[PDB]
Design an enzyme around this catalytic site. Structure first.
Site, short mmCIF file in Angstrom:
data_model
loop_
_atom_site.label_atom_id
_atom_site.label_comp_id
_atom_site.label_asym_id
_atom_site.label_seq_id
_atom_site.Cartn_x
_atom_site.Cartn_y
_atom_site.Cartn_z
N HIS B 41 0.80 -1.23 0.00
CA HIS B 41 0.00 0.00 0.00
C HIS B 41 0.84 1.30 0.00
O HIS B 41 0.29 2.39 -0.14
CB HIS B 41 -1.13 -0.01 1.06
CG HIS B 41 -0.66 0.14 2.48
ND1 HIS B 41 -1.01 -0.74 3.48
CD2 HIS B 41 0.08 1.11 3.08
CE1 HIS B 41 -0.49 -0.34 4.63
NE2 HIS B 41 0.19 0.78 4.41
N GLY B 143 1.88 6.21 10.32
CA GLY B 143 3.32 6.08 10.07
C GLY B 143 3.91 4.76 10.52
O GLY B 143 5.07 4.46 10.24
N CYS B 145 3.04 1.66 9.66
CA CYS B 145 2.98 0.49 8.78
C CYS B 145 4.36 0.02 8.39
O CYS B 145 5.30 0.84 8.27
CB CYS B 145 2.08 0.71 7.57
SG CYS B 145 0.32 0.79 8.03
#
Ligand code: G75
Ligand code: G75
Lengths: 306, 306
Positions: B41, B143, B145
């Site tokens: 993503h 932030g 991920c």
């Protein structure tokens, strides 16, 4: 979202752990620059521990009385000195993995990360609060002495704890990195026991703010309290008296949530008096006291889920 | 003595965290040998996230579409490929700090350490169980991920989790290091929600054994149960059915304490039916389910406090 007891990343500390052996006694040491720090009781046997005279025990040792092992490498000891309840061993090699560091004496109610270690090898990491009675609720077995507690600010490690003993209630006692004990404890066998403890009121309040930041308001109420009326309740429930200094410390959290400190105190008073009625706060069925206001700001969003 | 939620030392993982940027999106990556792993993503914008076609989005990227930053050093991307819900970025440099490692898919009920990370910089470490409903109760902000979960066996890091999303209940979902989601979740915007969860019965039993090892027997009783009669109670209290395999797993703990598994099951049945009567177990007022039998053996003494 979420809220967990969170330790600092331990890498900078792992690179500092070594093994220190004197006679048949092995425990952990902390290697910074060309010095290794460890509990002075490394020089004691089982029977010394009742009535040890550390000055007398130490004068009988040479540098080569001490073996220091860093990973698979032997570090030659080239000097030694006692500082309060620690030994400072000078070694032939400066630790190439020494981080930026400070020694700090932490205050009661404040938190730190513990790197549990055995035989110079780190085994685990968890977060602890320094209790009002100067103990920590750690998790330690034989071989764990010399394990350290620390905080990390930017890339600087603030060492604040070295582990020495377990008390009869199963809680833990130790020193700062100048070798001064937290609390009235001594590194010898006595009937010493942890004093009566108290709940850390400032931390409970911080955590209630954490709960509001994360989106939950169920426990708030329409009431306010004076500092003094709150404290009458706190005495009843074995909570630390709230001070104006504690109120001031809570300013930023109050500002972020729009809940005045004394209004949050009223909410706490009601929780103490009425219980939680089968409800949870941040997943907990009890009032948590091991997160500081700093810990809350570190972990929670800077934006309240309104 | 003591018993804490204990994470593995994080050092070996900290040396692997990097920052990955595509367009205006920055998140964390995991750098092992000459590969960087991150959530796919990273190639999506806000509006892509509803209905992204990752194959179509990715074919539009070159190697130089990706910026990888390790500390202050830029790593040049020399290849890329998608693997399920992750990207594998080939870089010009092998990570000199790569530990011995494996990729493992952990099973529901099992635990791991999470290294929360932001902008390639580790911020904290805590222990999580993989819930029966395939979520974790983590603590993550924007932030985070690409933050990873792991266990350490000897000096080998078994990576088992990479962080991708937060669900409406505030719990967390992610993939293994092959990019396969835990649970039925997808990396796009849907009304997806965590399924109903269950209490991890095997872990509760393990923790009761931990409590006996550490010296406490208050909750035991004179009764036994059959596996089937226990399970009728478990269904009532939303506990996972106990299996013979779970009984076998508890062998070593049973042996160390002298408490037969089905006798410990009888004790649990009574706790479920009667509550804890204002008492605690290992400091807890509730039945804890995030320690595995392995976690208990790792942390507790091998000698029961009889
Ligand atoms: C660290 C050194 C060690 O292992 O020595 C051999 C037992 C150890 C940590 C301690 C062990 C169990 N849990 C812990 O936290 N410290 C001691 O054993 C310590 C030595 C000492 C220090 C000051 C004063 C007197 C003695 N002794 C101690 O903690 O006594 C209580 C104890 C010991 C073993 C198990 C439970 C309680
Ligand atoms: C990681 C990436 C990121 O920060 O993107 C900008 C928001 C982030 C982790 C997430 C943020 C708050 N707590 C967390 O755990 N993941 C996402 O934001 C993720 C992207 C995504 C993935 C799969 C499917 C759809 C979207 N989106 C997401 O988790 O949505 C719920 C959410 C977002 C922000 C705050 C709370 C909940």
């Amino acid at each position: 979202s979420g809220f967990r007891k969170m330790a600092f990343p331990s890498g900078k500390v792992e690179g500092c752990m070594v093994q220190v052996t004197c006679g048949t006694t092995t425990l952990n040491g902390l290697w910074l620059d060309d010095t290794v720090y460890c509990p002075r009781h490394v020089i004691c046997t089982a029977e010394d521990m009742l009535n040890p005279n550390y000055e007398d025990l130490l004068i009988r040792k040479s540098n080569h009385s001490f073996l220091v092992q860093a990973g698979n490498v032997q570090l030659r000891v080239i000097g030694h000195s006692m500082q309060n309840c620690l030994l400072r061993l000078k070694v032939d090699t400066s630790n190439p993995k020494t981080p930026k560091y400070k020694f700090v004496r932490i205050q009661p109610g404040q938190t730190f990360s513990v790197l549990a270690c055995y035989n110079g090898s780190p085994s685990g990491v968890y977060q602890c609060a320094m209790r009002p009675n100067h103990t920590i609720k750690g998790s330690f077995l034989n071989g764990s002495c010399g394990s350290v507690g620390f905080n990390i600010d930017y890339d600087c490690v603030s060492f604040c704890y070295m582990h020495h003993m377990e008390l009869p209630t199963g809680v833990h006692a130790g020193t700062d990195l100048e070798g001064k004990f937290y609390g009235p404890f001594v590194d010898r066998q006595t009937a010493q026991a942890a004093g009566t403890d108290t709940t850390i009121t400032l931390n409970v309040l911080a955590w209630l703010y954490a709960a509001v930041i994360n989106g939950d308001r169920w426990f708030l109420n329409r009431f306010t309290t004076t500092l003094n009326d709150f404290n009458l309740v706190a005495m009843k429930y074995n909570y630390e008296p709230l001070t104006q200094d504690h109120v001031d410390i809570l300013g930023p959290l109050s500002a972020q949530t729009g809940i005045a400190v004394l209004d949050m105190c009223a909410a706490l008073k009601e929780l103490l008096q009425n219980g939680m009625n089968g409800r949870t706060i941040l997943g907990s069925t009890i009032l948590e006291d091991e997160f500081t206001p700093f810990d809350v700001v570190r972990q929670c969003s800077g934006v309240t889920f309104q």
